C-alpha cells in the first residue's frame, strides 16, 4: 500500500487504467457492443 | 621505495598524531 | 538499446576506463524521456565524472557525442557543422528543435537524420564535403 | 445537449503501447498459481 | 572476500538522528527522499522494535540496530 | 508443407528464450521483493576504446529509477513503403 | 488441462478443467475481446478484440509479454502457428496479417480482402489459412 | 559506554586511576554528538569525523593501557571491553601485523566500496605520492569520506 | 508589446506555434521537388513580408 | 596576482544566512523550503554579499586537485571555505577558459549543465545551443535604490562594476529601456558575471543612500537576446564568417 | 501532550539512573540454583 | 488455526534486513531499546511529514 | 491551429475537419504545415477519395508538379483498384503535354 502510494509521488498517476466490467457499467458497456455488433452486420450487408 | 629512517622521519612531519595528522603544510 | 556514443576526446587517452550503466537513470536533456545513463571519469584520480546527458536515439539523429553534444565525425558543434555544409551544398541545411515538450518527445522517435547528421553520419559524404570546402577556404549638443 | 454521445470508435491499444509505464503493484497480479498443468503423454 | 558488518560506534547514529531534525537545507533532498522510501518498511522496524521489548525484570536493554 | 519438427523446435527455443527474457525483465524491475524469486559487462567504443560496464549499487531507500514517470507519449508513423490494396473484382439499399 | 474463456467483459480468464473453476485472469485489454487462440507449443496465448491490437500473454505469470500493433480496428480473429508467422489475425480494417512476434511487426499484410475478415481457419494438414 | 544498571559488575581495581581520561573523552563525544545546525554538507560531514576519532583515539586510550604498557589488569581490560569503553573489534585489528594503525573498520569492508577495494586511506603515503608525481599532478586526496582519516597505513 | 498567450491549463498543454505538432513529412518519392521546394519557400517569405 | 597567495574566506561559517527564507505564508513547507498558505508581490532581495576581485581571489583546493570549475559562492561573495574550497576562487582567464574547452560545450564555468531551452525569463543556466556571451543587466532603478542618476553616469558604473569581471567586448546602455547589455570575449566570464553581479547593488560609498543599500531589490541580470540592430545583426554574420573559414583549415587539417 | 517534542535520550533519559524493576526476592536455599541469573537479559549467554 | 495451516516456503531468500544489511547505506550499532524507540518516533514522524 | 487541433483530438475521424484546416494552412500560405495537416488525414483515412483529391490539387494549384506527382503515384499505388486516381494521373500528365 505505501510503496504505490509513493510511487505515485515520485512516478505520477499511472495513464493507461483499463476500467472493468462491474455494476455499474453493465448497461453502458451492453450498450456499446450491442451498437457495435448492429453496427458491422449493417456496414457489412450493404453495398 | 624509501627506508625505515626516511619512512619515520616524514610520519613524524605529519601535523597532528594519529591518523588524522595532517600532511598539508 | 544500441551502445553508447561517445567519443576520444571525452574518453581520454587513458588506457582504460569504468563505466557505470545506470538504467532509466536520466531525462534526456532534448527529448525529455528517460534513458540509460552511463558515467564515467577520464581516471580514477580526476576529480570530474562525465555522464551522457541525451539519449542513444537524439545523438544518433544528431550524429553527436552523448556526453558533449559535439559532431561524431568533425568534433565541433551543431550550429556551425549546418553552416559549413550549408556554404558548400548551399541547400543551407539545417537541426530544427521542438519546443513542446509533446513534440520534443514525438521528434526523438523518427527514424531520421536531422541537419547536417546525413552529411557527417556517411562518412564518404564527409570526405566528399571537406574537399569542396577546400575550394571556399582558398578563395544636438 | 452533445455530451451525451454513440461510440464513433473504440480507443486503441496503439495509444497506451507509446506510453511509459508506471511501477504500481497491483493485489491481482501478486504470485499465485505459479505451477502450470501438464498433460499426460 | 567476505567480512562482517562493522560496528559503528552509537554516537555516529545518534549525531545523525540529532542533524535531521530540520531538513532546511538543498543537502537533504535526497535524505528527504530516503525518508519517503524508508515509509515502507516502517512496519518491519515496527515489529522488531516491539517483539524486543524489554520485559518487566529487566531495567534496561542493549539492542542492535541495523541504520540508514 | 508443415513445417518440419527441426524447424518447430528452432523457433519454439527462440521464442521461448525471448519470452522469458521478457518475463524476467518484467519481473526484475518489479518493485516487490518476491518476484525476484519467479526470474529464470565489456564494451568497445569507437576504434579501440575498452570500456568496463559496472552496475551501480543503487540505494535501497531511493527510486530505483530516477527517470521513470507516467508520461504520455504521441509516436510518429513510419511510413517507409506503401502497401498496396489489391481489391481485385437498385435503390434497395 | 485448460480452457481459456473471453467475453465482451473485457476478461480473458483461465479455467483449470481438473476443478472446474477459473485459476487466471488476464487483465488488460481496453475493451471487448473476441478471439483467443493457444500457442501450439508454447505457454503462451493470444487474444484480440476491439482495441485493435494482440496480446500475448505468459501463461504462468498473466503478464502481457508482447503486444502487436497494426491493424486500423477491431481485430475478429487470431490463429498461432508453431513457426512464423506464430500469428495471424484478422480484423475490421479488412485486412489478414501475418506476425513475428519476437520482432513485434508484421511479416506481411494481405489486402486482398474488401470487408472485415470475420473468419479464419487453419488447415490441419498443410501450412495454409 | 552503556548505562549502569543491575547487569553491570562493579568496576574492577584500577578504573579510577584512568577514570578522569576516560570521563574527557566521554565529555569531547557528548559534545561532538550534538546538533550544531551545519549548512554545508562538507561540514556536517566533518562533524560525522570528529566523532570517529574520538571513537578510534578512547580504544586506542586503552589498547595502549593493555597491551603496550600493560598498566591496566586483564580483569579491568574485559570490563571496559564489556562496558563498551573500547571497541574490540577495532582493538582486534590493531593487534594484526598491517593494521596497527587502523582509522576505523569501515576503511576495511572491501564489500562496500563500488571497486571492491579498501578505502584509499588504506594506501602508504609514499605510494599515492609517487603515483602523483609520475602522473604529473599533486596528490589530491585529503580526507577520506567515511571518517576524515587522512592516511592510516602502518608505515605513517 | 507582444500580445498575451492564454495560459497553459497543464504541464504538457502545446502552442501550435512553436512548431508544426506531430509533423508528417510528406513519404519521399521518384520525383525530384527540389526546385519546387525553393519557389514554395520564396512565396512564403514574400507572402509575410 | 591571485596565484600570489592563498584564498580568502569571505563569509564565516556562523554568518552565512539561515536557509530557511523570510517568511511570506503561514506555514513553512519542510519539502520545498518555502512558505505557504500567503501571497507576496515581489520576492527578491538585494544580495548582502559581494566579489572583490582583487581582495577575495586566491589558491583553493582546487588549483592543486586540477579542478576545472569555479566557485559558484566565490563569484557570489559568499564562499566560507577560503583556501580549503574545492573549486576555484579567481576570475576565469584564458588559461581555464583553454582548460573547460570540451566540458563547456555542455556545462557552464561553475559545471552545472546547460538546458535545451533558455527559461521564458531568460535567467539561469543558459541554453547548450547558443554560444551566448551577452547579459542583460535590468532593475537597475532598484540597483540604485531609485537614486536619480543621467543616463552616462548608470553606464560608467555598470563598466565599473562588470570590466573587473574579465574581458569586455562591448557594453551598451539603453536609455529607451532603462536598460544595459554587456558582452564579454568568452562565455564563461558571461556566466561567471551574470552570478557574480545577480541581485547586487550599483551604489557606491560616494552615495547617500549607500547605508540603506539592501532596502529594495537588487540588480536584475540575465541573457541577453537575439540583438534586432541591423548593424549588430551584419557584424554576427560576419563573425560567423570568420568562424567557418577559421574551422575549415581544421576540417582540411583533420581530412 | 500532543504539543511536547519527543525528549532527546542522551540529554534527558541517559544520565539518570534506572528504577527497581520486577524482581521477586528469591530464597538463598530453595533458589540456589537459579538465583544468580534468572533475572538476566539473556540468563546464561556466556556459561559455555 | 489448527484446522487451516499455512505452511511456509522453502524459499529463505531475499529477507529484508539482511538484504539491507549487504548495502553500504546501512550500518550497524548497539543502543538502549528506549533510545531506539524514540528514533523510531522522531524518524516515522520526520516520514509522515 | 488550437481550435481545430481541438477539435481533431476529440474526434480524428472527422474528416471534413481535416480538409478545411488542411486548406486554412494553405490560406497562410504555409504548405510545409498544409502538407502535414493532409498527411495526418492520410494516416486517419487512406480510403477517403476526396482526400487524396484535395491533397493532389492543392499540390497542382500551387505548381507542385513534382510534389503532386510523388503523390498521385502514391495514390495509384495504394488504391489501385479506384479508376479516379489513375485518371487524375493521366488528366495530370496530358495537360503538360508529357
Ligand atoms: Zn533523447
Ligand atoms: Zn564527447
Ligand atoms: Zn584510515
Ligand atoms: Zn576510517
Ligand atoms: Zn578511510
Ligand atoms: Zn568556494
Redesign the interface.
Same mark, same amino acid.
Given at each position: 500500500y505505501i510503496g504505490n502510494l509513493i510511487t505515485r509521488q515520485f512516478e505520477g498517476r499511472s495513464n493507461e487504467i483499463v476500467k472493468t466490467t462491474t455494476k455499474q457499467r453493465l448497461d453502458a458497456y451492453y450498450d456499446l457492443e450491442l451498437r457495435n455488433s448492429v453496427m458491422d452486420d449493417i456496414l457489412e450487408m450493404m453495398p | 621505495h624509501?627506508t625505515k629512517s626516511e619512512?619515520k622521519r +616524514? +610520519?613524524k612531519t +605529519?601535523k597532528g598524531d @594519529?591518523? $588524522? @595528522? !595532517? $600532511? !598539508?603544510s | 538499446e544500441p551502445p553508447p556514443n561517445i567519443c576520444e576526446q571525452c574518453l581520454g587517452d587513458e588506457a582504460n576506463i569504468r563505466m557505470t550503466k545506470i538504467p532509466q537513470g536520466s531525462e534526456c536533456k532534448i527529448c525529455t524521456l528517460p534513458f540509460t545513463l552511463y558515467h564515467f571519469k577520464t581516471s580514477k584520480r580526476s576529480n570530474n565524472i562525465i555522464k551522457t546527458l541525451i539519449c542513444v536515439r537524439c545523438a544518433t539523429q544528431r550524429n553527436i557525442c552523448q556526453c558533449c553534444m559535439l559532431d561524431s565525425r568533425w568534433h565541433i558543434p551543431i550550429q556551425l557543422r549546418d553552416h559549413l555544409i550549408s556554404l558548400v551544398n548551399e541547400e543551407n541545411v539545417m537541426t530544427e528543435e521542438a519546443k513542446n515538450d509533446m513534440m520534443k518527445r514525438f521528434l526523438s522517435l523518427k527514424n531520421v537524420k536531422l541537419g547536417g547528421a546525413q552529411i557527417t553520419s556517411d562518412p564518404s559524404e564527409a570526405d566528399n564535403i571537406v574537399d569542396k570546402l577546400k575550394n571556399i577556404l582558398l578563395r544636438v549638443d | 445537449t452533445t455530451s451525451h454521445r454513440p461510440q464513433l470508435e473504440a480507443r486503441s491499444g496503439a495509444k497506451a503501447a507509446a506510453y511509459t509505464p508506471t511501477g504500481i503493484e497491483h493485489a491481482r497480479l501478486l504470485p499465485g498459481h505459479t505451477t502450470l498443468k501438464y498433460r499426460k503423454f | 572476500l567476505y567480512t562482517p558488518k562493522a560496528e559503528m560506534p552509537p554516537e555516529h547514529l545518534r549525531k545523525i538522528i540529532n542533524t535531521h531534525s530540520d531538513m532546511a537545507s538543498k543537502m537533504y533532498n535526497t535524505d528527504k527522499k530516503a525518508f519517503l522510501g524508508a515509509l515502507k518498511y516502517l512496519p518491519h522496524a515496527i515489529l522488531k522494535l516491539l517483539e524486543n521489548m524489554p520485559h518487566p525484570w529487566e531495567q534496561a536493554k542493549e539492542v542492535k540496530v541495523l541504520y540508514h | 508443407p508443415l513445417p518440419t519438427k527441426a524447424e518447430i523446435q528452432e523457433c519454439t527455443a527462440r521464442t521461448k528464450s525471448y519470452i522469458q527474457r521478457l518475463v524476467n525483465a518484467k519481473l526484475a524491475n518489479s518493485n516487490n521483493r518476491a518476484s525476484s524469486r519467479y526470474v529464470t559487462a565489456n564494451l568497445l567504443l569507437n576504434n579501440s576504446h575498452h570500456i568496463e560496464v559496472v552496475s551501480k549499487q543503487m540505494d535501497p531507500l531511493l527510486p530505483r529509477f530516477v527517470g521513470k514517470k507516467a508520461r504520455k507519449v504521441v509516436a510518429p508513423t513510419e511510413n517507409d513503403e506503401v502497401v498496396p490494396v489489391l481489391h481485385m473484382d437498385p435503390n434497395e439499399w | 488441462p485448460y480452457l481459456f474463456s473471453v467475453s465482451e467483459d473485457k476478461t480473458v480468464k483461465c479455467w483449470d478443467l481438473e476443478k472446474n473453476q477459473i485459476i487466471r485472469d488476464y487483465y488488460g485489454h481496453l475493451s471487448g475481446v473476441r478471439t483467443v487462440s493457444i500457442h501450439p507449443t508454447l505457454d503462451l496465448i493470444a487474444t484480440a478484440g476491439r482495441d485493435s491490437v494482440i496480446k500475448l500473454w505468459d501463461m504462468r505469470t498473466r503478464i502481457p509479454v508482447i503486444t502487436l500493433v497494426g491493424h486500423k480496428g477491431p481485430i475478429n480473429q487470431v490463429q498461432c502457428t508453431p513457426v512464423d508467422p506464430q500469428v495471424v489475425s484478422s480484423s475490421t480494417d479488412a485486412t489478414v496479417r501475418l506476425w513475428d512476434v519476437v520482432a513485434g511487426k508484421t511479416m506481411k499484410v494481405l489486402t486482398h480482402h474488401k470487408r472485415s475478415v470475420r473468419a479464419t481457419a487453419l488447415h490441419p494438414k498443410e501450412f495454409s489459412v | 559506554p552503556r548505562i549502569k544498571t543491575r547487569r553491570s559488575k562493579p568496576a574492577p581495581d584500577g578504573f579510577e586511576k584512568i577514570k578522569p581520561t576516560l570521563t574527557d573523552f566521554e565529555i569531547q563525544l557528548r559534545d561532538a554528538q550534538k546538533d550544531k545546525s551545519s549548512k554545508l554538507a562538507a561540514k556536517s560531514n566533518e562533524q560525522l569525523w570528529e566523532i570517529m576519532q574520538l571513537h578510534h583515539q578512547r580504544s586506542r586510550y586503552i589498547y595502549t593501557l593493555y597491551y603496550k604498557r600493560k598498566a591496566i589488569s586483564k580483569d579491568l581490560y574485559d570490563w571496559l571491553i564489556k562496558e563498551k569503553y573500547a571497541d574490540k573489534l577495532l582493538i582486534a585489528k590493531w593487534r594484526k601485523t598491517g593494521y596497527e594503525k587502523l582509522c576505523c573498520l569501515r576503511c576495511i569492508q572491501k564489500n562496500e566500496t563500488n571497486n571492491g577495494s579498501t578505502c584509499i586511506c588504506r594506501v602508504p603515503r609514499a605510494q599515492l605520492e609517487e603515483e602523483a608525481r609520475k602522473k604529473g599532478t599533486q596528490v589530491s586526496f585529503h580526507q577520506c569520506v567515511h571518517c576524515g582519516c587522512r592516511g592510516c597505513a602502518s608505515t605513517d | 508589446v507582444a500580445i498575451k498567450k492564454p495560459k497553459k491549463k497543464y504541464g504538457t498543454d502545446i502552442d501550435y506555434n512553436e512548431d508544426i505538432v506531430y509533423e508528417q513529412a510528406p513519404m519521399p518519392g521518384i520525383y525530384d521537388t527540389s526546385t519546387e521546394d525553393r519557389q514554395i519557400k520564396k512565396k512564403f517569405e514574400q507572402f509575410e513580408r | 596576482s591571485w596565484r600570489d597567495k592563498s584564498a580568502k574566506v569571505q563569509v564565516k561559517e556562523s554568518e552565512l544566512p539561515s536557509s530557511i527564507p523570510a517568511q511570506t505564508g503561514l506555514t513553512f513547507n519542510i519539502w520545498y523550503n518555502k512558505w505557504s498558505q500567503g501571497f507576496a508581490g515581489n520576492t527578491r532581495f538585494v544580495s548582502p554579499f559581494a566579489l572583490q576581485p582583487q581582495l577575495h581571489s586566491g589558491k583553493t583546493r582546487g588549483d592543486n586537485d586540477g579542478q576545472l570549475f569555479f566557485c559558484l559562492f566565490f563569484a557570489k561573495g559568499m564562499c566560507c571555505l577560503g583556501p580549503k574550497c574545492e573549486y576555484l576562487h579567481h576570475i576565469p582567464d584564458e588559461e581555464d577558459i583553454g582548460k573547460l574547452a570540451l566540458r563547456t560545450e555542455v556545462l557552464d564555468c561553475f559545471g552545472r549543465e546547460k538546458f535545451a531551452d533558455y527559461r521564458e525569463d531568460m535567467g539561469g543556466i543558459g541554453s547548450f545551443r547558443k554560444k551566448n556571451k551577452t547579459l542583460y543587466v535590468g532593475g537597475i532603478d532598484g540597483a540604485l535604490n531609485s537614486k536619480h542618476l543621467k543616463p552616462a553616469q548608470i553606464e560608467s558604473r555598470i563598466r565599473f562594476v562588470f570590466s573587473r569581471l574579465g574581458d569586455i567586448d562591448r557594453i551598451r546602455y539603453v536609455e529607451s529601456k532603462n536598460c544595459g547589455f554587456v558582452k564579454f570575449k568568452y562565455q564563461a566570464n558571461a556566466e561567471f558575471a551574470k552570478e557574480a553581479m545577480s541581485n547586487q547593488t550599483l551604489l557606491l560609498p560616494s552615495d547617500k543612500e549607500w547605508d540603506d543599500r539592501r532596502e529594495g531589490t537588487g540588480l536584475l541580470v540575465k541573457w541577453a537576446n537575439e540583438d534586432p540592430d541591423p548593424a549588430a545583426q551584419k557584424r554576427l554574420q560576419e563573425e560567423l564568417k570568420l568562424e567557418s573559414l577559421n574551422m575549415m583549415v581544421h576540417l582540411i587539417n583533420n581530412n | 501532550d500532543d504539543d511536547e517534542p519527543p525528549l532527546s535520550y542522551e540529554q534527558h533519559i541517559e544520565n539518570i539512573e534506572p528504577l527497581d524493576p520486577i524482581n521477586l526476592p528469591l530464597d538463598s536455599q530453595d533458589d540456589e540454583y537459579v538465583k544468580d541469573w534468572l533475572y538476566d537479559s539473556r540468563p546464561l549467554e556466556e556459561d559455555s | 488455526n489448527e484446522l487451516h495451516p499455512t505452511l511456509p516456503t522453502n524459499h529463505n531468500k531475499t529477507k529484508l534486513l539482511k538484504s539491507l544489511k549487504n548495502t553500504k547505506y546501512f550500518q550497524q550499532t548497539t543502543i538502549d531499546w528506549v533510545e531506539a524507540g524514540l528514533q523510531l518516533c522522531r524518524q516515522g514522524h520526520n516520514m509522515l511529514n | 491551429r488550437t481550435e481545430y487541433e481541438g477539435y481533431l483530438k476529440r474526434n480524428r475521424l472527422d474528416m471534413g475537419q481535416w480538409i478545411r484546416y488542411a486548406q486554412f494552412e494553405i490560406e497562410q500560405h504555409d504548405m510545409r504545415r498544409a502538407r502535414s495537416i493532409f498527411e495526418r488525414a492520410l494516416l486517419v483515412d487512406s480510403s477517403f477519395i476526396p482526400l487524396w483529391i484535395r491533397y493532389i490539387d492543392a499540390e497542382l494549384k500551387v505548381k507542385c508538379i513534382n510534389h503532386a506527382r510523388n503523390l498521385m503515384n502514391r495514390a495509384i499505388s495504394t488504391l489501385p483498384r479506384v479508376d479516379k486516381l489513375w485518371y487524375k494521373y493521366l488528366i495530370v500528365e496530358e495537360s503538360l503535354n508529357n
Amino acid at each position: 500500500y505505501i510503496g504505490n502510494l509513493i510511487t505515485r509521488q515520485f512516478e505520477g498517476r499511472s495513464n493507461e487504467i483499463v476500467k472493468t466490467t462491474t455494476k455499474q457499467r453493465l448497461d453502458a458497456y451492453y450498450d456499446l457492443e450491442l451498437r457495435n455488433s448492429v453496427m458491422d452486420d449493417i456496414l457489412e450487408m450493404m453495398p | 621505495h624509501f627506508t625505515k629512517s626516511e619512512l619515520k622521519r +616524514r +610520519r613524524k612531519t +605529519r601535523k597532528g598524531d @594519529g591518523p $588524522w @595528522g !595532517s $600532511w !598539508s603544510s | 538499446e544500441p551502445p553508447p556514443n561517445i567519443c576520444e576526446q571525452c574518453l581520454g587517452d587513458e588506457a582504460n576506463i569504468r563505466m557505470t550503466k545506470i538504467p532509466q537513470g536520466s531525462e534526456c536533456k532534448i527529448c525529455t524521456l528517460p534513458f540509460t545513463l552511463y558515467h564515467f571519469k577520464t581516471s580514477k584520480r580526476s576529480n570530474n565524472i562525465i555522464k551522457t546527458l541525451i539519449c542513444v536515439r537524439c545523438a544518433t539523429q544528431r550524429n553527436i557525442c552523448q556526453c558533449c553534444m559535439l559532431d561524431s565525425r568533425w568534433h565541433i558543434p551543431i550550429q556551425l557543422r549546418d553552416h559549413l555544409i550549408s556554404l558548400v551544398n548551399e541547400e543551407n541545411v539545417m537541426t530544427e528543435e521542438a519546443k513542446n515538450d509533446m513534440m520534443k518527445r514525438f521528434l526523438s522517435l523518427k527514424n531520421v537524420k536531422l541537419g547536417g547528421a546525413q552529411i557527417t553520419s556517411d562518412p564518404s559524404e564527409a570526405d566528399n564535403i571537406v574537399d569542396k570546402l577546400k575550394n571556399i577556404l582558398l578563395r544636438v549638443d | 445537449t452533445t455530451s451525451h454521445r454513440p461510440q464513433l470508435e473504440a480507443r486503441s491499444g496503439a495509444k497506451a503501447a507509446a506510453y511509459t509505464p508506471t511501477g504500481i503493484e497491483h493485489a491481482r497480479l501478486l504470485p499465485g498459481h505459479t505451477t502450470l498443468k501438464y498433460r499426460k503423454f | 572476500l567476505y567480512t562482517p558488518k562493522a560496528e559503528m560506534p552509537p554516537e555516529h547514529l545518534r549525531k545523525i538522528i540529532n542533524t535531521h531534525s530540520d531538513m532546511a537545507s538543498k543537502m537533504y533532498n535526497t535524505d528527504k527522499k530516503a525518508f519517503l522510501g524508508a515509509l515502507k518498511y516502517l512496519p518491519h522496524a515496527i515489529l522488531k522494535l516491539l517483539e524486543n521489548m524489554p520485559h518487566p525484570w529487566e531495567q534496561a536493554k542493549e539492542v542492535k540496530v541495523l541504520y540508514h | 508443407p508443415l513445417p518440419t519438427k527441426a524447424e518447430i523446435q528452432e523457433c519454439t527455443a527462440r521464442t521461448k528464450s525471448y519470452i522469458q527474457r521478457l518475463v524476467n525483465a518484467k519481473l526484475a524491475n518489479s518493485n516487490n521483493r518476491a518476484s525476484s524469486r519467479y526470474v529464470t559487462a565489456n564494451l568497445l567504443l569507437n576504434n579501440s576504446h575498452h570500456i568496463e560496464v559496472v552496475s551501480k549499487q543503487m540505494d535501497p531507500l531511493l527510486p530505483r529509477f530516477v527517470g521513470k514517470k507516467a508520461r504520455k507519449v504521441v509516436a510518429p508513423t513510419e511510413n517507409d513503403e506503401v502497401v498496396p490494396v489489391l481489391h481485385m473484382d437498385p435503390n434497395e439499399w | 488441462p485448460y480452457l481459456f474463456s473471453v467475453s465482451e467483459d473485457k476478461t480473458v480468464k483461465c479455467w483449470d478443467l481438473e476443478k472446474n473453476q477459473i485459476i487466471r485472469d488476464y487483465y488488460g485489454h481496453l475493451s471487448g475481446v473476441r478471439t483467443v487462440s493457444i500457442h501450439p507449443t508454447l505457454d503462451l496465448i493470444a487474444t484480440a478484440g476491439r482495441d485493435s491490437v494482440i496480446k500475448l500473454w505468459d501463461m504462468r505469470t498473466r503478464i502481457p509479454v508482447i503486444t502487436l500493433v497494426g491493424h486500423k480496428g477491431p481485430i475478429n480473429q487470431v490463429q498461432c502457428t508453431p513457426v512464423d508467422p506464430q500469428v495471424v489475425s484478422s480484423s475490421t480494417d479488412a485486412t489478414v496479417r501475418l506476425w513475428d512476434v519476437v520482432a513485434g511487426k508484421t511479416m506481411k499484410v494481405l489486402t486482398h480482402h474488401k470487408r472485415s475478415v470475420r473468419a479464419t481457419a487453419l488447415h490441419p494438414k498443410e501450412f495454409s489459412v | 559506554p552503556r548505562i549502569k544498571t543491575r547487569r553491570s559488575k562493579p568496576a574492577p581495581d584500577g578504573f579510577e586511576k584512568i577514570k578522569p581520561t576516560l570521563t574527557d573523552f566521554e565529555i569531547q563525544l557528548r559534545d561532538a554528538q550534538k546538533d550544531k545546525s551545519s549548512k554545508l554538507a562538507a561540514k556536517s560531514n566533518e562533524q560525522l569525523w570528529e566523532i570517529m576519532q574520538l571513537h578510534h583515539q578512547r580504544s586506542r586510550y586503552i589498547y595502549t593501557l593493555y597491551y603496550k604498557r600493560k598498566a591496566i589488569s586483564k580483569d579491568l581490560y574485559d570490563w571496559l571491553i564489556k562496558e563498551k569503553y573500547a571497541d574490540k573489534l577495532l582493538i582486534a585489528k590493531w593487534r594484526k601485523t598491517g593494521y596497527e594503525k587502523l582509522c576505523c573498520l569501515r576503511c576495511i569492508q572491501k564489500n562496500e566500496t563500488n571497486n571492491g577495494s579498501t578505502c584509499i586511506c588504506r594506501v602508504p603515503r609514499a605510494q599515492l605520492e609517487e603515483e602523483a608525481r609520475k602522473k604529473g599532478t599533486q596528490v589530491s586526496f585529503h580526507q577520506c569520506v567515511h571518517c576524515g582519516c587522512r592516511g592510516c597505513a602502518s608505515t605513517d | 508589446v507582444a500580445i498575451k498567450k492564454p495560459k497553459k491549463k497543464y504541464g504538457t498543454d502545446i502552442d501550435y506555434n512553436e512548431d508544426i505538432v506531430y509533423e508528417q513529412a510528406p513519404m519521399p518519392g521518384i520525383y525530384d521537388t527540389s526546385t519546387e521546394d525553393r519557389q514554395i519557400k520564396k512565396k512564403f517569405e514574400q507572402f509575410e513580408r | 596576482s591571485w596565484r600570489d597567495k592563498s584564498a580568502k574566506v569571505q563569509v564565516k561559517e556562523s554568518e552565512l544566512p539561515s536557509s530557511i527564507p523570510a517568511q511570506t505564508g503561514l506555514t513553512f513547507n519542510i519539502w520545498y523550503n518555502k512558505w505557504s498558505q500567503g501571497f507576496a508581490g515581489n520576492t527578491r532581495f538585494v544580495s548582502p554579499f559581494a566579489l572583490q576581485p582583487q581582495l577575495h581571489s586566491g589558491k583553493t583546493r582546487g588549483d592543486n586537485d586540477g579542478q576545472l570549475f569555479f566557485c559558484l559562492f566565490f563569484a557570489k561573495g559568499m564562499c566560507c571555505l577560503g583556501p580549503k574550497c574545492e573549486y576555484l576562487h579567481h576570475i576565469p582567464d584564458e588559461e581555464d577558459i583553454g582548460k573547460l574547452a570540451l566540458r563547456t560545450e555542455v556545462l557552464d564555468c561553475f559545471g552545472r549543465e546547460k538546458f535545451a531551452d533558455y527559461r521564458e525569463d531568460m535567467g539561469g543556466i543558459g541554453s547548450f545551443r547558443k554560444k551566448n556571451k551577452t547579459l542583460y543587466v535590468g532593475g537597475i532603478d532598484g540597483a540604485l535604490n531609485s537614486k536619480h542618476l543621467k543616463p552616462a553616469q548608470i553606464e560608467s558604473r555598470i563598466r565599473f562594476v562588470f570590466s573587473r569581471l574579465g574581458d569586455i567586448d562591448r557594453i551598451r546602455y539603453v536609455e529607451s529601456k532603462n536598460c544595459g547589455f554587456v558582452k564579454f570575449k568568452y562565455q564563461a566570464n558571461a556566466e561567471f558575471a551574470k552570478e557574480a553581479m545577480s541581485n547586487q547593488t550599483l551604489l557606491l560609498p560616494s552615495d547617500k543612500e549607500w547605508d540603506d543599500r539592501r532596502e529594495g531589490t537588487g540588480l536584475l541580470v540575465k541573457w541577453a537576446n537575439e540583438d534586432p540592430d541591423p548593424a549588430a545583426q551584419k557584424r554576427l554574420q560576419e563573425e560567423l564568417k570568420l568562424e567557418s573559414l577559421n574551422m575549415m583549415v581544421h576540417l582540411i587539417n583533420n581530412n | 501532550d500532543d504539543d511536547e517534542p519527543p525528549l532527546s535520550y542522551e540529554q534527558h533519559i541517559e544520565n539518570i539512573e534506572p528504577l527497581d524493576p520486577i524482581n521477586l526476592p528469591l530464597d538463598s536455599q530453595d533458589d540456589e540454583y537459579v538465583k544468580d541469573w534468572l533475572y538476566d537479559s539473556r540468563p546464561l549467554e556466556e556459561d559455555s | 488455526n489448527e484446522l487451516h495451516p499455512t505452511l511456509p516456503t522453502n524459499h529463505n531468500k531475499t529477507k529484508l534486513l539482511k538484504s539491507l544489511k549487504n548495502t553500504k547505506y546501512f550500518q550497524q550499532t548497539t543502543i538502549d531499546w528506549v533510545e531506539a524507540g524514540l528514533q523510531l518516533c522522531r524518524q516515522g514522524h520526520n516520514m509522515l511529514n | 491551429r488550437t481550435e481545430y487541433e481541438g477539435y481533431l483530438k476529440r474526434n480524428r475521424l472527422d474528416m471534413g475537419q481535416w480538409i478545411r484546416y488542411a486548406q486554412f494552412e494553405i490560406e497562410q500560405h504555409d504548405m510545409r504545415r498544409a502538407r502535414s495537416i493532409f498527411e495526418r488525414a492520410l494516416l486517419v483515412d487512406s480510403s477517403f477519395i476526396p482526400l487524396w483529391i484535395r491533397y493532389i490539387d492543392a499540390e497542382l494549384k500551387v505548381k507542385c508538379i513534382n510534389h503532386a506527382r510523388n503523390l498521385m503515384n502514391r495514390a495509384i499505388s495504394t488504391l489501385p483498384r479506384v479508376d479516379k486516381l489513375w485518371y487524375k494521373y493521366l488528366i495530370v500528365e496530358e495537360s503538360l503535354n508529357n
